[PDB]
Amino acid sequence: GPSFPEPKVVRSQGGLLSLKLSATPTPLAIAGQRATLLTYGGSFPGPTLRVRPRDTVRLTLENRLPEPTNLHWHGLPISPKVDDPFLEIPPGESWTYEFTVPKELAGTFWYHPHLHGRVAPQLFAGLLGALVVESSLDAIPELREAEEHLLVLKDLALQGGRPAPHTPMDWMNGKEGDLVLVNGALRPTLVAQKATLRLRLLNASNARYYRLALQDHPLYLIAADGGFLEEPLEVSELLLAPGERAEVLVRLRKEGRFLLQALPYDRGAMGMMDMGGMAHAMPQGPSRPETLLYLIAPKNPKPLPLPKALSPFPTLPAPVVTRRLVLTEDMMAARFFINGQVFDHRRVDLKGQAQTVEVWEVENQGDMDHPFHLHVHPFQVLSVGGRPFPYRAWKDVVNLKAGEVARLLVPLREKGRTVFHCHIVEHEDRGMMGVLEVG
Amino acid sequence: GPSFPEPKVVRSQGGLLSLKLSATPTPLAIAGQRATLLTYGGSFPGPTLRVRPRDTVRLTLENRLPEPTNLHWHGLPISPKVDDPFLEIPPGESWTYEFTVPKELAGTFWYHPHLHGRVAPQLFAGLLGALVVESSLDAIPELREAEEHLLVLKDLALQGGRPAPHTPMDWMNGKEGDLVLVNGALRPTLVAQKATLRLRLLNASNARYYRLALQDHPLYLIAADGGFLEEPLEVSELLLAPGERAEVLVRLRKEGRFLLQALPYDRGAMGMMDMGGMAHAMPQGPSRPETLLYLIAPKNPKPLPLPKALSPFPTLPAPVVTRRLVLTEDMMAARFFINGQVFDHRRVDLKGQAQTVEVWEVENQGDMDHPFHLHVHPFQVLSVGGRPFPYRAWKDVVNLKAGEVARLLVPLREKGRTVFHCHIVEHEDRGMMGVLEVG
Ligand SMILES: [Cu+2]
Ligand SMILES: [Cu+2]
Ligand SMILES: [Cu+2]
Ligand SMILES: [Cu+2]
Ligand SMILES: [Cu+2]
Ligand SMILES: [Cu+2]
Ligand SMILES: [O-]
Ligand SMILES: [O-]
Structure with a gap:
């Protein structure tokens, strides 16, 4: 193969x-x-x-x-x-x-x-x-001539020849596995044939984060979850939270073997300890570094030039409402909340008007990272943690570290009832989800 | 007396x-x-x-x-x-x-x-x-030393020694009377004793407008419906729609008799005519001019200086929602609507959050002037007909001529159910009213 x-x-x-x-x-x-x-x-x-x-x-x-x-x-x-x-x-x-x-x-x-x-x-x-x-954009020379691959980042743990069962601690943290795989393979080798690679990246893990870095190389971000950026953005590393996607160009700089790694990252997962009369929660700390794949560059790589532009981001109408959604946790109960409530499929939480734009301020008042996802209505991230986003593109998941506020511009598209929830899927299952009705 | x-x-x-x-x-x-x-x-x-x-x-x-x-x-x-x-x-x-x-x-x-x-x-x-x-502001010398009077502007029609009954045309237009009175008196005489007058003005008519002008004098606006301006505003005339209030200073310039008049004003009231196969609606046109009172200035008037400042207008929080309310008419039915509906006491139309600020855009798509009133929550008029308001002050009624849009900044104060409606009271009775619930 x-x-x-x-x-x-x-x-x-x-x-x-x-x-x-x-x-x-x-x-x-x-x-x-x-x-x-x-x-x-x-x-x-x-x-x-x-x-x-x-x-x-x-x-x-x-x-x-x-x-x-x-x-x-x-x-x-x-x-x-x-x-x-x-x-x-x-x-x-x-x-x-x-x-x-x-x-x-x-x-x-x-x-x-x-x-x-x-x-x-x-x-x-x-x-x-x-x-x-x-996209018709895939036909521009700078993309058409790149070597394209999909990378599905998903981890797994096995027990008795089946996926390992969820523990109580798994429902609190979100489950991570020891087998850190790419396209279901363990540390595969990618032998590049072209000097420019176009990689479509998907985090399909329940809870694991991938702080991506390619040895000796920057990455050029060209698309976020739901569409292209306006122009490529050079980055030294790229954090993908559960549910997020990205597309990058890689411009191989010389012959050799380069590791694509998931660098150590602390998402606030918790353990338990007992040091002589305790039995209380203690941070797990940063993940151990993982090698995702081995990238082998071809002989005398001469990468293509970057495209000068990608896709202009739509100019959006002025917003007509501002929403505030606050995320909180009860870790020992493995219960997770939005504005003090758990999900109830019968309860409508937000009612909005199709074809208007809203500003959603999502605030993480917990200690864990929570990756916030909205169905049906892609959004533009304006800022997170008070820092302006360095690009315009459609996203549908946005990661919030402890205490951070994300400001989103949310055009409401299709009418009907849908949901928003943490994409730490254990947290959604355990209540961190709400109902939006668009009419 | x-x-x-x-x-x-x-x-x-x-x-x-x-x-x-x-x-x-x-x-x-x-x-x-x-x-x-x-x-x-x-x-x-x-x-x-x-x-x-x-x-x-x-x-x-x-x-x-x-x-x-x-x-x-x-x-x-x-x-x-x-x-x-x-x-x-x-x-x-x-x-x-x-x-x-x-x-x-x-x-x-x-x-x-x-x-x-x-x-x-x-x-x-x-x-x-x-x-x-x-107000403690009434103690400043420039107001304390003025001669103060209240002027309740209300018209009346009598028939058989009682108020004249409403006709079908009255329910369509709002009823106006031939007796145009001030404090229930017919063209009273105000013999001024001081050169500066402070007049509190109230339009308590069902439907009559008062385009106020004092012969040979400007008026100095110092308060709108619900509070002082930031500083006096000189005006040549002052339109008071039904339900509105204002306070003005008058600075008598020389001895003599000066008429305070309600100048001709066309509010879009309608009549009917038949010119050989018609029987259709025709504009009544401008009201006939009315003398409201005779003002007699004292000898050698030396008006006080104007106060340099009145009351600073509150700096309001940024708004969290924009509303659009459209007024329409069915004149021949004497039915009047807000967003296509008539009032229903059981139906909540807008739901807002106490202590937030909203922007209300009220648009008159009818041909009559409609004076829009909101209970409980005084507002700041930002603009009307696309023209910026020349002052900041609290109002609770805003007049809209045919086709005009008013933009209001509405801080929501007390919790509970209240209403908003045209203050052409016949129009409110005939359905031009809606329900706001603040929680
Ligand atoms: Cu998903
Ligand atoms: Cu979560
Ligand atoms: Cu979902
Ligand atoms: Cu009233
Ligand atoms: Cu009206
Ligand atoms: Cu009222
Ligand atoms: O999901
Ligand atoms: O009223």
Whole structure:
């Protein structure tokens, strides 16, 4: 096979991507060992769906799990009557999602379960896959001539040949695994054939963060979760929180082997200790460094020039309301709150007007990082922790460290009921989610 | 009596204004004729209540009318659980309103009925009176030494010794009367004893406008509906719409007789005509000019200097929502709407948060002027018809000519349910009113 493993791609044909996927326990070979995971399409990750704007997607999901499940089309600005976070597909039953890909859209998106209370174990077990929306921008020489790869960053822990069960501490912290994988492979080797790489990055982990750095190289950010930046942005490293995506150009500078690493990062996960009459919570501290892949540069690399521009960001109408959403924690209870409440599917929390713009101020009053996700309505991050964002682009997840306030500009698009929640999926399952109704 | 008639004043005593008023049909002498009006306290206008900040008001209203009634404390930022627009006092019954006068308050306010569907005939018949909140600012020499008078501008029409009944055309236009009175007197004479006058002005008419101008003199605006300006503003004339108040200084320039007039003004009232196969609506055009009073200046008037400053206007927090309220008409039906709906006491139209500030954009899409009033929450008019307001002061009524948009800054104060409506009271009775709930 290709030294670099990537999920199989399924492309739309004549403007239609019609596909039947099954969610099923699947025996497979994973990181040198045999395990049974929960998969879509018999693979981990699931197949990459590759579409263009205005395509019709017709995806029939067959549920072959012992529990109910559904799909969240993460990041897609489509109707919540399609991307329905309240829908339940019972074991043995099927449901067809049908939608048109929005005309003004490009980037890396993904699909995974969103049945409240069951997301963390289902995602941790292997249920996820990517969706790429191809753009006319991909035809510019500086992108067309780059070597393109998808990197699905997802960790795993195995016990008795199955995904390790959630502990009480896992529900508090979000579960992380010792197998830190790229496209379901353990430290794969990418032997570059071109000097410029275009990497689409997806954090599909329950809770693990990836503080990305390539040895000896900067990265050039060209897209965030939901679309291109206006121009490339040079960065020395790039933090991807759970649920986030990014696309970078890598400009290989000389021959050799370069490690792509997840550098140490402290997201505020907690342990317990007892030092002679305690038994109380203590910080886990920064993650241990991980090597994600080995990048081998070609001979005498001469990278392409960077594109001078990407996509102009839309000029948005002036906002008509400001919202404040405060995140808090009860760590020992593994309970998580938005404005003092836990999720209730029957309760509407915010009511907004389609085609208006809102300012959402999301404040983290907890001690853990929380990555805040909104369905259906991509947003522009204005600032976080009081620091202006250095680029304009569509995002749908924004990470907040302890005490930080994020200011978001949120155009309301499709009408209907949808949700917002922490994308530490254990925290969502444990209540950190609310309901937005757009009319 | 004093050549200049003004309503009797009732003052708070030791910080308490405790008074029993009856609403009653009362035979009286009015403009040289005998008529029975509906009055508070046996007079037209009702007694002027004069209080200071932090006073307690305890007003027991006894209903001696054949129909139910209640009181609206127009312009007072108090709780809508006291100023209750939904309360009904049945015939023969009594109700005690008790409240504390807010500490940061000054100006001319008023009281009148607000029982939906019955306001226009009750107000037209004589049920209203003024309330003055005295200020420590009244002690500055430039105000203390002026000669002060209240001018209640209210018109009336009589038929068979009683207020003339409402016609169908009256419900469409708002009713105006041929007797254009000041303090219930017909063209009284004010023989000034001082060269500077301080006049508190109240438009307590159902629908008549007063385009005020004093012959040969400017007016110096020093207060709007609900408080002082920051400094006096010189004007050549001053339009008072129904429900509005103002306070002006007049600086008498030489000996002589000067008319205070209501100059011609076209508020968009309509008539009907038939010119050989028509029977359709036709503009009434501008009102005929009216003389309101004769002002006699004293000998060798030497007016005081104007105060350099009045009261600094509060710096308000940034707003958290923008509202749009559109006024429309169905003239032939005498139906009037806000955002396409008529009033329903059971329906909440806007929900806001106490202690936040909102921007309200009120747009008149009708052809008549409509004077928009909000209970409980005084506002700052930013602009009307796209023209910046030339002063900062609290208002609670804002006039909109055909097609004009007013932009208001609305701090939400007391919690509870209250209303907003056109102060053309016939239009309110006929549906032009909505419900705001503050929580
Ligand atoms: Cu997601
Ligand atoms: Cu969280
Ligand atoms: Cu979600
Ligand atoms: Cu009023
Ligand atoms: Cu009106
Ligand atoms: Cu009112
Ligand atoms: O999700
Ligand atoms: O009123």
